Assembly symmetry: C3
Homo-oligomer: 223 residues x 3
């Protein structure tokens, strides 16, 4: 039974590889055939439309428009708060409006000069600048590009770049894909640098509120 004791070892690894491949293909097929509440072009155009005003007025108008076109998918004013985001070596702030297992919409930006690693996840993230500047340094190149209000950067799936923002840079962010892949990145600098677990609690609270809102909307649609 020495040959069969080794047959288990060989076949168990093949089974693990086949199961992981089947799970990845299943998730990819689900993501390709799923119905989405928002599309990235919608958010990008809505942001470019109000990018000419003050970024706070733009925030207000964009939130109003999002609640009008997609009722039941955006948090109310009593649940909106700015939460610090320390990640990839940079530090900014977010205001989450919607978040599911496959989509999230928020208002991002920083009042200080920061920059770092953009992350590399199984999701596509679009960023439309309302004010400020956004320097992107794509992988495998020696030159970066600066983007201004109105522009939209698309951090593609599986791509990793370097991001840099000047003081007062604010944008509207929409992420689509497998959102939990980002989660770990979003927490790294909080665990091994800032030690700001209170901000971690705030982040957990707002994400939980968005997920519960989406679940309650699904239940209301069913009854």
């Amino acid at each position: 039974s020495v040959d069969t004791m080794a047959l288990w070892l060989g076949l168990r690894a093949v089974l693990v590889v086949a199961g992981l491949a089947v799970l990845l293909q299943l998730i990819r097929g689900w993501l390709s055939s799923k119905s989405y509440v928002f599309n990235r072009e919608e958010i990008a155009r809505l942001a470019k439309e109000h990018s000419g005003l003050d970024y706070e007025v733009a925030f207000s108008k964009i939130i109003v428009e999002l609640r009008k076109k997609h009722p039941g998918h955006i948090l109310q004013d009593e649940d909106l708060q700015w939460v610090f985001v320390n990640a990839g070596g940079w530090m900014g702030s977010m205001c989450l409006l919607h978040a599911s297992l496959t989509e999230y919409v928020l208002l991002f930006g920083t009042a200080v000069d920061t920059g770092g690693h953009s992350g590399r996840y199984w999701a596509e993230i679009s960023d439309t600048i309302l004010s400020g500047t956004f320097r992107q340094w794509k992988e495998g190149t020696t030159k970066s590009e600066i983007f201004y209000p109105g522009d939209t950067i698309v951090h593609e799936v599986g791509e990793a770049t370097s991001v840099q923002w000047s003081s007062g840079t604010w944008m509207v962010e929409y992420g689509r894909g497998f959102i939990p892949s980002t989660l770990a990145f979003a927490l790294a600098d909080t665990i091994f640098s800032t030690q700001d677990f209170l901000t971690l609690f705030y982040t957990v609270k707002v994400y939980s509120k968005a997920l519960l809102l989406e679940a309650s909307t699904h239940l209301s649609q069913l009854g």
Copy 2:
């Protein structure tokens, strides 16, 4: 007998929260009751007095004045050394003059442009700029404020901000509260980023020196 299973846990958690509340009340009352070697106004005025001259001359004059007004509570010239401080995503350097379990005084600053998370501890930290600029971004806002020589930033207890310092920014720092709460923060980037454990040794050394000086001064004053 099944009801007691969950009754053990349910009231026990309230008792645990009450016990930590009693510990917090004891520590909070001890801080107000405690007599303090320094007050933030004293350090702030002493630093602002010399904020108009060169930052090195200001360092020397402030150290001499502190040794004059509080003998036995400030390290001698043989114990002063600049130690790198990597924390919260920023990098500066410190020279510790005094440190107890509830107070610390030091000269902080950086010769490079840095910035990051300010930390969130159970202590109030006052910073009086001797030279340079200090950008502070408070939590929950979208705009930051720049402070110049003469100004004083008060990192309040439990609040977290974003700090940014330009090249050649130097200040006098006084912290009061529960000092060990900051400790972990002060080491995070050293453990998970810089790997400069020699600087960790230097920091532990100066902290131990200050604590031993404070203990010996207490023993000498008591007898």
Copy 3:
């Protein structure tokens, strides 16, 4: 057996100290008597010679000259790729040309504004600027210095500094000493911040390619 058991601990600790000291002395004596493919002056002069041109033209000419003078010790064009480097709180990009256990040559630089801790390892690292600016802040001082194309920074063994690079700063890097000492540093920010394990894989790939090239060259010299 109290007297005997305390005897165990003392001799055990002395044995550990003596063994670690003998290992360190062995490695240092080996490093002092080893033949090296490159010297820092060679790389520094070769980079300063082409420091007047564009950093890409300089890269190509320097690679050509290095492959001409030292054939079989530098990877070919099919193995060269730019890999992101997140370390010490800064983010740049590298292109490795040569790497052994005691030497490494690469082209380093960043297209974004970054800076942080320089690291502290058992190796000397020379950096000859082809373009941009390099701000160095030495340990124990309150002033930094800016260096321009043509200059050479020598990150000495055991010294720790603060580095800062402007957008578009590119240089040629040569490191000599005990290379594994740097290893932890090179991965720290990747494990506890970026979570970009694909870039980790790329780094491992290029390091393995350079090491295998060196091993195959030694075998070819032997036969």
